[PDB]
Amino acid sequence: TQTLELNRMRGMLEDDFNRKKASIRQAVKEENQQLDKQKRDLEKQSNNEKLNYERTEIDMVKTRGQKRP
Amino acid sequence: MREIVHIQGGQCGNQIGAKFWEVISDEHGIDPTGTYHNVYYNEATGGRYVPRAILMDLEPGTMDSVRAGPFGQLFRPDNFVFGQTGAGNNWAKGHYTEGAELIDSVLDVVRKEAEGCDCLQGFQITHSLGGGTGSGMGTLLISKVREEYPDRIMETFSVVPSPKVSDTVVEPYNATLSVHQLVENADECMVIDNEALYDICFRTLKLTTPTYGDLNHLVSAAMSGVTCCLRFPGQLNSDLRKLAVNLIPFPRLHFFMIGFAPLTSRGSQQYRALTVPELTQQMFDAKNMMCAADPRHGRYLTASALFRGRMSTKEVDEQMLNVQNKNSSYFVEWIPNNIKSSICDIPPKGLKMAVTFVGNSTAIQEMFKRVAEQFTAMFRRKAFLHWYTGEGMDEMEFTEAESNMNDLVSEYQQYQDATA
Numbered sequence: 478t479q480t481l482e483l484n485r486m487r488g489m490l491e492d493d494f495n496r497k498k499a500s501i502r503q504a505v506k507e508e509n510q511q512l513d514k515q516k517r518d519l520e521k522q523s524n525n526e527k528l529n530y531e532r533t534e535i536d537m538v539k540t541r542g543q544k545r546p
Numbered sequence: 547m548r549e550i551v552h553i554q555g556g557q558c559g560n561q562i563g564a565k566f567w568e569v570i571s572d573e574h575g576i577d578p579t580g581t582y583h584n585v586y587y588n589e590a591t592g593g594r595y596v597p598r599a600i601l602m603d604l605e606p607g608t609m610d611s612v613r614a615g616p617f618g619q620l621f622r623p624d625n626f627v628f629g630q631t632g633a634g635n636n637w638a639k640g641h642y643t644e645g646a647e648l649i650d651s652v653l654d655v656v657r658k659e660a661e662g663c664d665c666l667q668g669f670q671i672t673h674s675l676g677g678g679t680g681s682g683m684g685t686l687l688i689s690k691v692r693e694e695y696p697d698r699i700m701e702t703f704s705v706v707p708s709p710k711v712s713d714t715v716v717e718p719y720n721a722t723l724s725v726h727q728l729v730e731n732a733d734e735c736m737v738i739d740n741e742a743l744y745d746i747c748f749r750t751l752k753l754t755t756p757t758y759g760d761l762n763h764l765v766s767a768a769m770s771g772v773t774c775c776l777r778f779p780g781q782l783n784s785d786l787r788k789l790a791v792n793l794i795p796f797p798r799l800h801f802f803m804i805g806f807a808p809l810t811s812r813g814s815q816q817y818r819a820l821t822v823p824e825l826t827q828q829m830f831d832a833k834n835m836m837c838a839a840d841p842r843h844g845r846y847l848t849a850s851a852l853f854r855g856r857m858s859t860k861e862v863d864e865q866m867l868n869v870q871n872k873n874s875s876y877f878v879e880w881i882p883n884n885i886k887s888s889i890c891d892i893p894p895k896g897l898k899m900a901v902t903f904v905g906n907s908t909a910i911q912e913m914f915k916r917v918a919e920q921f922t923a924m925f926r927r928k929a930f931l932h933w934y935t936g937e938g939m940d941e942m943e944f945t946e947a948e949s950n951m952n953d954l955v956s957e958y959q960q961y962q963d964a965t966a
């Protein structure tokens with residue numbers, strides 16, 4: 478009975494340790510998923526901003542007609 | 547009565563010592579606060595039990611690492627004498643320059659611990675053979691104390707270079723410089739290797755994630771079981787000197803292999819029984835020992851087995867007789883009853899049986915063969931020498947050291963064959 482009381486100790490401790498480590502790994506996976514959104518969004522913002530700026534530049538250039546004094 | 551001084555050294559020595567005091571505490575029922583809830587500890591006014599030890603290293607970082615872990619409060623704040631500059635794994639750093647300027651105070655405090663006892667039976671060292679700090683300061687302290695106390699005994703629980711991979715690429719040089727002075731002034735060189743402990747904690751326990759804590763715990767169990775038949779009653783008691791005579795037949799062939807039993811995983815623990823047969827089979831199991839040398843490829847000059855637990859004795863004797871009359875070829879025959887037994891009356895906390903096996907065999911001569919091989923290779927090319935001569939040491943010593951090593955193995959193999 479004592480050796481069973483102790484083997485269940487070992488078993489419970491190990492089947493808790495492993496679940497804890499797997500939880501840590503899942504948390505790291507979530508952290509990387511989160512980090513991905515930064516490079517997903519900053520690039521979108523910079524793309525839209527380049528679009529706006531270069532469109533405004535095209536406009537300002539094209540807005541040169543004739544003077545006719 | 548029959549105390550033990552605990553000299554440490556090197557980071558490995560310090561870690562193993564911390565774990566060893568942990569095991570002795572939760573066996574003697576000393577909680578890490580230092581109370582009880584003479585062989586090792588020392589009574590201290592206020593109701594404390596300060597463990598008689600001493601910790602030396604050229605880095606005061608190991609200080610904080612060992613005081614950080616539990617059971618660190620046991621060690622008194624005074625024994626932590628540590629050097630500053632660090633040896634950086636250079637034998638001369640930890641044996642000539644930093645040695646001759648701190649080993650003075652080391653000897654002073656060691657003597658203070660010594661006279662404080664009534665019968666200091668023997669010493670006890672925990673260190674390494676690789677690092678400059680460990681190996682160097684350890685062999686120097688051992689030479690000093692054996693010039694100090696020619697009556698006492700010596701013992702070093704030394705870790706050696708693993709065969710497959712090496713920790714510090716200059717391992718052969720520090721190893722041979724430690725063995726050239728250890729073989730002369732030391733009686734019980736308990737050799738250990740990290741690869742054997744790796745294979746033990748994986749194969750025989752299925753533990754997939756071993757850490758140096760667990761390996762140090764295993765070597766702690768071995769070191770404890772070595773002497774546990776002394777501080778406890780027993781139908782047949784021994785000590786740290788009956789071993790020495792039952793173990794060394796000669797002034798040199800005194801380098802012991804170590805083994806422990808029983809050890810089993812979670813799965814195989816429900817099935818296997820637990821009786822003197824199984825303990826014996828794990829005892830003489832090849833891989834169960836903690837040495838990177840399968841003893842089956844040599845013989846034993848002798849071997850002792852300290853059991854633990856209130857059990858029978860006819861089983862003990864008849865199984866010694868069986869394991870000696872069946873594995874007679876792997877034993878040596880020019881000696882009669884080449885095994886020795888000892889029995890105690892207390893198994894470790896949590897079981898009802900235990901075995902600590904010690905073997906003076908001729909199978910580590912292969913390890914010394916490989917060390918001498920590495921030395922010759924890295925020496926004919928003078929590799930990594932300007933560190934070992936830029937600090938007041940000539941190559942001459944080195945050469946003769948290897949010579950000594952040769953003579954060592956030149957003995958072992960010899961007695962393997964000679965008969966009468």
Ligand SMILES: Nc1nc2c(ncn2[C@@H]2O[C@H](COP(=O)(O)OP(=O)(O)O)[C@@H](O)[C@H]2O)c(=O)[nH]1
Nearest residue numbers: 556557558561635674676677678679680713758
């Ligand atoms: N089994 C075991 N071996 C260790 C441990 N720590 C260090 N070792 C060994 O210690 C050896 C280095 O010797 P050491 O004197 O401690 O290095 P130093 O402090 O730089 O002089 C290396 O081969 C390590 O593998 C440990 O915690 N457990």
